[PDB]
Amino acid sequence: DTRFHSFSFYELKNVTNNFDERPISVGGNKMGEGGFGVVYKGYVNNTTVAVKKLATEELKQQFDQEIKVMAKCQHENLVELLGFSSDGDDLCLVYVYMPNGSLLDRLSCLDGTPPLSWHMRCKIAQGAANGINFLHENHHIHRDIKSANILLDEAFTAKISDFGLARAVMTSRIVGTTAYMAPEALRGEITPKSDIYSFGVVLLEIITGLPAVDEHREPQLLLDIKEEIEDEEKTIEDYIDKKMNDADSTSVEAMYSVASQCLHEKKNKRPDIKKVQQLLQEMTAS
Ligand SMILES: Cc1cc(-c2nc(C(=O)Nc3cn(C4CCOCC4)nc3C(N)=O)co2)ccn1
């Protein structure tokens, strides 16, 4: 489709069963939730869509900024915005429906989905890196790269999502997700090098199948396994997701080497996204 649609609030309310907050499994419409708002499944113009209901003038400005960023950022590895609603009670954004949900939910097999093969994980890592490359080429810093923000379409093509914190340098309002954040981002710096660090945590989640933070785990933060492997207390083999049957040591170690480079403590020692893209291609190169 070739245009952004203005939707009525009542149409979005109607097609989401009055913004039914129950999960889809029990008969509801909720698909995702966070600080941004709630994402609901809807049906508009004989098509399934995702509706983000934003959770006053400052919120209207972030809504306008989100529309602006999505209108400029159209790429096969970015979620596509279809339309918006601002006439009624709440502000809504309508996106292309991602039938295979988030990479976080697919890694945890949420709702009974089969585990992702190593082959599919390599394709998703490459796709996500292609999306970040587009953002950085167009001078955008995502600021919240994480597996919950990597969505998957009908063909498991990776789509970077949630550009609510994106910026086109220091800040006094530090935003992002702690378990994925680079040390300089936690201190207030705004740099695309921080997105690279966060992508390195995503690569560890892909290799291990483990969440970035788990209170009932040692270590609690996934990024800390890099030190265990460097100090030879553990190997990458010990951490490889046992829910795969097709992982091979060579390609897993090649992905771990990229993740390790991304997780360098000094921002200038990290590879840029073009180099990450090159290394991920060499991993599967024939
Ligand atoms: C925060 C955000 C989200 C979006 C967006 N989300 C979708 C979408 O379709 N999301 C999902 C769909 N399913 C399942 C599909 C299978 O059945 C259960 C829900 N999970 C999700 C999910 N975990 O977000 C499309 O755009 C855009 C901008 N900011």
Description:
The chain is an alpha+beta fold. It has 2 domains: 5-96, Phosphorylase Kinase, domain 1; 101-284, Orthogonal Bundle (Transferase(Phosphotransferase), domain 1). The protein has helices spanning 9-15, 57-72, 103-107, 118-137, 183-186, 192-208, 225-230, 236-239, 249-262, 273-284, and strands at residues 5-6, 30-33, 37-44, 47-54, 81-85, 92-96, 150-152, 158-160. α4 (118-137) packs antiparallel against α6, α4 runs antiparallel to α10 (273-284) and α9 packs antiparallel against α10 (273-284). Bound molecules: ligand A1JDQ. The site of ligand A1JDQ has 18 residues, from β2 and β4.
Produce a short descriptive summary:
It is classed as transferase. The chain has 286 residues and is α+β, with helices and mostly antiparallel strands.
